[PDB]
From a paper:
[name], an RNR-specific repressor, controls the transcription of RNR genes and, often, its own, in most bacteria and some archaea. In contrast to all earlier suggested mechanisms, we show that the [name] monomer contains two nucleotide-binding sites, one inner site that binds ATP and one more exposed site that can bind either ATP or [name].
The structure of [name]/ATP-loaded [name] in the absence of DNA (3.1 Å resolution) reveals an octameric complex composed of two tetrameric assemblies. 2D classification of this dataset showed a particle population consisting predominantly of [name] octamers, with a small population of [name] tetramers. Apart from a slight adjustment of the angles of the Zn-ribbon domains the two tetramers in the octamer are virtually identical to the tetramer that interacts with DNA. Tetramers competent to bind DNA are locked in an octameric form in which the Zn-ribbons of two tetramers face each other. The octamer would therefore need to dissociate to bind DNA. PISA analysis reveals that ~3700 Å2 of SAA are buried in four distinct small interaction areas between tetramers, compared to ~8550 Å2 buried within each tetramer. This implies that interactions between tetramers are significantly weaker than those within tetramers. The predicted free energy of dissociation of about –13 kcal/mol suggests that the octamer is unstable or marginally stable in solution, thus liable to dissociate into tetramers. In the octamer, the 6-NH2 group of [name] makes an H-bond to the main-chain carbonyl group of a neighboring monomer.
Residue numbers in the entry:
A (entry chain D), B (entry chain C), C (entry chain B), D (entry chain A), E (entry chain G), F (entry chain F), ...: 1 to 147
Write the structure that this text describes.
């Protein structure tokens, strides 16, 4: 890997160790140009198994865009949207699995989303859960009232 | 019409092409004085007053995009929502005001969207109107039960 | 032109008259389907002769987008941006010419822009006037201070 | 590393492709237990803390877009600003913090942009910093005269 | 169905979403043996044999693009040609062959396009069939007069 | 699934059986509108695990585009390209696995490709196998000569 | 203008003369870096006044694309299409006017087009002249037969 | 220069903007006779004669796209190939012919591409030259060994 301090095309791994739980590998490497050691973390690519079976790369941008579509004309700032996206990403990586279904990401969005805007939660749950009729919205309203 | 460049009282229509869905006919006109083409568009002016007080031409695609956002995840085909939009344009041009607030446009879209989809109506009403709390969604639900 | 009340493919002009100053033609027409008269205004297409010589259609959307690029992180709402765009469009159509250069539109933006945000004016004048060095910004600051 | 799906302590690197400009090496790894490919990306983590408090990977294109917006209408070639961005990434990875606020990123870009272009520096400083009134532009101008 | 990865005779349908215009239902299925999602699509197979002898799924957009190219400059609205395409798909699925040459598809489109537009029919027939000389256009014209 | 003959929104499965090897499920269904039975095949979505780990849907269009990039200025017709794409798709589905790596698809392209154009094979193998230097091309030339 | 031989940012015009008919200006310039003189031609930008009044830059690519749309499945090579585009461009620049209407470009395409493919001429005239019904095609066939 | 619309011997340059990478300066000029803006572009004319015998302006992006296609899967960064293209334009403008066949352009690109990448040279030489059989690739390989 190209040295952050010397831009060398090639570098050698002088240390490679497994991190706790093995969710990452710590690889320190010595460059041959400026001889400055640099450490790197090798982590699994978080994949989202879309509902068509496509495993796209995980992107908090899509999560934030969906929540923003739910949060239209609401007292929800871009800072709050970014914080919710970060919380969703942190939860789904703390789950540990490399591939999460879009259903899991939707659930990870929903439980925090109640705190940012309960009404935005309703618009997000309606599109995400594919609420068939007002019975589904009334059921969703019930659950929001039940704790 | 007066040439826009030299103000000659007469100007002949070299060519005239209509818009098939647009109530606009685009005409290329020659001015006999300076011999300069100029393009004119003939259209009944539906001009909506936005919430900012500015005036914009009544555009189909704005209504289309609003309905599509409301209908995401509901079965409305691109053809059905295009029809909703055609129906709304026909209704608002019909009212014959020629200068209507976008509040009137929103009211025009909602009555057809109740027929097209109720989850979309709640999602369109939720974004269009404020819907600050779940109480607004319950009041709107009550309103849709009434009918 | 298709009737706003009857959707007929073809209609006949039963009255055509020239408006004051000839900036528009008033054409009333009778439809053959529902026999409801409708009046229309035939106006020149406002063209913007871009600095490459291309005469694009006038669009206040481009004006508002440019001003918004100038108005980044400022206390300038979308309502204010739309109002400035409307003012620019009104000024350039009150000029009367069908083709205005981008320089004319830039000037029509600049004089109102001082009222919405003087600092945004500086960022808009710097890109628009192609301010070569800080001497140009100091000269622009002088003019803003000189009335 | 532990397979993300069954947690097997050893997992062989089927393939490994580096990113030429990216300090990222993408590796496909097989798990001997469940025989399932999984993708890992090895990268020193430059993670900027946004103004919202969220954490994002240090992206070249954000710096590139910021500089390009500042330079619009100034002669900076796409190559020169790409270099500015490379220089900024080299400087911030160098500082060796591995977790820097976007304020640090903004300061990193400004010193090179003063060399690249002064109209751009004022336009970048104007947008980056608040610049509420012309007084901020005069203070910054004074600062650039000093140097 | 047999899991594609371990061939387990039974596999439960975790989820099933239909295509609204597509005669395709997309199902996510779990295999109890290896616990791996897999996506299946359920569709009557209209499979056209191209002029090259290859087999392709019967796609609406191919017919739509062919008709639109034929109709360029003729008044057919995007809705009318979409209908022509729907009508053609209904006719060819109806014939019940399930494996038809694109010659059959071309014949299916031409009879409806004669109703939709005659300039388009000559332009579609001209491109579809060879039409080497003006004599082919006169023969086709004679054929359209006959009817 | 919407009836091919009656367009009904909903239909019921009146027969569902597993095909030989379980690569598909045969589902015959009776519509409620025109009461015409229609049979459908439910098959796994062929997924291509890209070299980044993304499992895109299998598309012979990408295969044909890559081969066409290899087959530049060659005596290889579009019919031959489509036939090669069909052969590759048939081979990869006869493999039976739902997910094939891009390496497997590349191999399935390479062995037939020798028959369509050996020189195009060289250009496809060089990009696909990432031939480092002329030693790799000489080795590839050797294998083409060795049967 | 940047020297072709020294890449200098600025150069001075050491000779500027008007060419015959004034369709171009011959400007020879001496660079200050490598002191190598280079001559340049300053010509008017050929503008095409589109049928909407927009004056786009002239592009033979659009002409060739339109002719290619007419020349579908014909014995007309890409070399012939490029030659026809060059002939059209040469004719329209030999006309001398800076702005030509799309009608003039269409006429300049039509008369040569008869030589490349008379049948393609018919498909190009039908879209371009907006042939209303088979009477227009029969009239076009007559003119092609009349010399 | 003579006005293109009325042929007035003198026409003043209202404005003049250069192209930074382009050897083109775009000037808006007023004609005192008819008072009509017109746009002129001043450029040394590199005009390549294609294999079809037609003449096209020497475009950077054609060389860039040719090199990028040759380099796909080889490490050449978008910056390196942009440089190759700049170097080729500098070499061909330098030769001072002002009218060169695209064969000369191809020869100009190949000598730099040998330095940039040998797999790309074989892939560029393979597509550029015919390379009917593996014997052409062996002859070219021999040629690259020689050097
Ligand atoms: N690749 C991805 N990475 C991260 N989040 C994603 C990704 N794709 C979708 N999401 C988010 O996960 C949530 C799940 O959305 P949802 O399941 O409705 O989408 P989907 O599976 O793409 O649906 P559809 O295919 O029907 O459009 C949404 O908030 C969506 O924005
Ligand atoms: N130019 C337009 N032409 C036609 N319909 C429009 C136009 N602009 C908005 N509408 C429609 O009218 C309605 C107005 O909705 P709403 O009041 O929420 O927005 P708004 O007036 O544009 O204000 P905001 O600044 O919040 O966007 C929507 O249904 C929208 O699709
Ligand atoms: N077609 C248009 N209609 C209305 N306003 C426009 C149009 N094109 C540009 N403008 C606006 O007019 C102003 C003039 O901008 P400016 O002269 O710098 O642009 P330009 O001529 O397009 O420049 P360039 O070609 O160098 O990018 C800007 O605010 C721009 O947004
Ligand atoms: N993810 C990122 N990676 C690298 N640089 C970034 C990233 N995000 C922002 N930057 C850069 O760092 C600087 C931060 O600027 P600034 O403080 O104005 O924006 P911000 O922190 O993103 O806040 P805001 O919410 O206002 O956009 C800019 O120069 C920007 O280009
Ligand atoms: N995959 C497809 N699905 C449905 N209809 C198709 C498909 N491919 C082609 N068609 C349609 O069937 C007709 C076949 O036309 P035609 O015989 O000219 O082309 P072709 O068989 O694709 O051969 P070519 O190689 O010349 O393109 C056209 O009307 C086309 O739109
Ligand atoms: N989704 C797909 N469906 C079918 N074929 C595909 C798909 N993606 C790629 N292919 C084809 O499979 C072959 C394998 O190509 P290759 O492995 O070089 O691509 P890749 O994995 O996408 O590479 P990269 O990510 O480095 O660009 C190519 O012929 C490519 O066109
Ligand atoms: N900017 C341009 N430069 C050169 N040729 C052009 C340009 N625009 C159009 N043409 C060509 O000129 C001819 C005239 O075509 P035509 O008049 O039907 O197009 P148009 O005016 O763009 O029509 P429409 O606006 O109705 O789509 C066509 O062959 C077209 O490809
Ligand atoms: N307009 C152009 N300006 C500059 N370079 C060009 C231009 N057109 C082609 N070239 C370049 O010159 C070389 C010519 O290659 P080649 O002989 O294979 O193609 P050609 O002359 O365009 O013929 P063909 O009809 O086969 O495309 C290529 O390297 C190409 O990138
Ligand atoms: N119009 C809407 N109103 C409210 N919430 C919405 C709306 N559209 C989307 N959402 C919410 C709920 C959806 O499950 C979530 C993601 O929407 P969607 O468009 O499927 O995003 P995505 O990221 O999955 O996109 P894609 O499938 O195109 O990759 O965002
Ligand atoms: N995410 C959403 N989900 C559901 N409906 C939505 C969503 N976003 C917007 N809508 C609906 C309600 C709004 O009244 C309507 C149009 O909203 P908006 O985004 O303001 O566009 P607009 O047509 O008003 O454009 P503009 O105001 O910029 O001219 O669409
Ligand atoms: N980054 C910027 N900061 C401040 N003002 C800007 C910025 N970019 C543009 N502007 C302002 C001044 C410009 O003259 C005006 C229009 O910019 P520009 O991108 O040329 O718009 P335009 O509408 O002319 O676009 P185009 O030429 O692409 O059609 O907006
Ligand atoms: N119109 C503009 N003119 C000049 N500079 C600008 C303009 N807009 C932004 N900039 C500069 C100053 C900002 O600090 C920098 C980046 O701004 P911004 O639009 O917030 O993107 P970003 O990189 O911070 O992305 P995000 O915050 O969405 O992740 O670019
Ligand atoms: N320029 C044109 N004008 C009129 N009709 C056209 C034109 N080009 C094509 N068509 C018509 C006649 C053809 O039979 C039909 C489809 O043509 P084609 O371009 O071969 O696409 P296709 O649907 O066959 O795709 P493919 O063969 O690549 O799968 O469209
Ligand atoms: N310039 C080229 N010359 C010869 N063969 C090529 C060229 N480019 C690509 N190929 C061949 C070999 C490659 O493995 C194959 C696919 O190329 P690539 O662009 O990676 O396609 P892809 O379908 O994988 O695209 P993507 O990765 O963007 O989805 O095509
Ligand atoms: N389907 C077609 N079959 C035959 N000739 C066609 C077809 N489509 C276009 N043509 C011919 C006649 C048209 O006048 C000419 C240009 O078509 P058009 O799409 O208007 O091109 P253009 O270059 O004017 O595009 P645009 O208006 O989008 O800039 O090409
Ligand atoms: N798939 C490819 N792999 C490698 N090099 C390629 C590939 N395709 C083209 N090239 C190279 C060799 C060609 O001489 C050069 C340009 O090819 P080409 O596609 O004819 O474009 P061009 O620049 O000649 O445009 P045009 O002839 O249409 O004006 O690029
Ligand atoms: Zn180093
Ligand atoms: Zn006049
Ligand atoms: Zn009527
Ligand atoms: Zn495992
Ligand atoms: Zn299994
Ligand atoms: Zn039925
Ligand atoms: Zn020089
Ligand atoms: Zn003149």
């Amino acid at each position: 890997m190209h040295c952050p301090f010397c831009r060398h095309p090639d570098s050698r791994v002088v240390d490679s160790r497994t991190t706790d739980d093995g969710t990452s590998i710590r690889r320190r490497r010595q460059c041959p140009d400026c001889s400055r050691r640099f450490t790197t973390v090798e982590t699994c690519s978080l994949m989202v198994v879309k509902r068509s079976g496509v495993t796209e790369p995980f992107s908090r941008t899509k999560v934030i865009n969906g929540v923003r579509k739910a949060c239209q004309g609401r007292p929800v700032t871009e800072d709050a949207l970014a914080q919710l996206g970060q919380r969703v990403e942190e939860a789904v990586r703390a789950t540990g699995s490399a591939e999460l279904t879009t259903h899991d990401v939707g659930l990870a969005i929903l439980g925090p989303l109640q705190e940012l805007d309960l009404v935005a939660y309703l618009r997000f749950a309606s599109v995400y859960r594919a609420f068939d009729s007002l019975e589904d919205f009334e059921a969703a309203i019930a659950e929001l009232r039940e704790t």
